[PDB]
Amino acid sequence: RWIARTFFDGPEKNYERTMAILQIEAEKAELRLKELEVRRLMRARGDGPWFHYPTIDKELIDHSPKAT
Amino acid sequence: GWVRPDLGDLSKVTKVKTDRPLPENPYHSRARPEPNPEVEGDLKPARHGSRLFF
């Protein structure tokens, strides 16, 4: 009982805790698997703003020339 | 018949002209597919590094 105080965390700790660490771990694992799933799609088809190659130009010239 | 300009033409406008309407797609056939939708809203830190650690 003396060893339980100021030397031990207790059974309440690491049961309420660790599950909190697992809750962050579950979020870290699912989003990393989602990142592997998103990059597998975004690289194959140019749909989103990920792995997009730069284009030539947006605007260059529109004025009237001396063309035929 | 005698009329001589001592300056030039300097781009004259034809307001009386009608004939055919100007916008009628001179060369364009396809409208080109819509670009990637712009993400609106401020980014928030949620995962805080999806690397091997932290």
From Swiss-Prot, chain A:
It is found in: Mitochondrion inner membrane. Belongs to the complex I NDUFB5 subunit family. Complex I is composed of 45 different subunits. Accessory subunit of the mitochondrial membrane respiratory chain NADH dehydrogenase (Complex I), that is believed not to be involved in catalysis. Complex I functions in the transfer of electrons from NADH to the respiratory chain. The immediate electron acceptor for the enzyme is believed to be ubiquinone. This is NADH dehydrogenase [ubiquinone] 1 beta subcomplex subunit 5, mitochondrial. It comes from Bos taurus. The lineage of its organism: Eukaryota, Metazoa, Chordata, Craniata, Vertebrata. The chain holds residues 119 to 186 of 189 of the full protein.
From Swiss-Prot, chain B:
Residues 18-44 are annotated as: Disordered. It is found in: Mitochondrion inner membrane; Mitochondrion intermembrane space; Mitochondrion. It comes from the Eukaryota. Residues 31-44 have a biased composition (Basic and acidic residues). Contains four C-X9-C motifs that are predicted to form a helix-coil-helix structure, permitting the formation of intramolecular disulfide bonds. Complex I is composed of 45 different subunits. Accessory subunit of the mitochondrial membrane respiratory chain NADH dehydrogenase (Complex I), that is believed not to be involved in catalysis. Complex I functions in the transfer of electrons from NADH to the respiratory chain. The immediate electron acceptor for the enzyme is believed to be ubiquinone. Belongs to the complex I NDUFA8 subunit family. This is NADH dehydrogenase [ubiquinone] 1 alpha subcomplex subunit 8. The gene is NDUFA8.
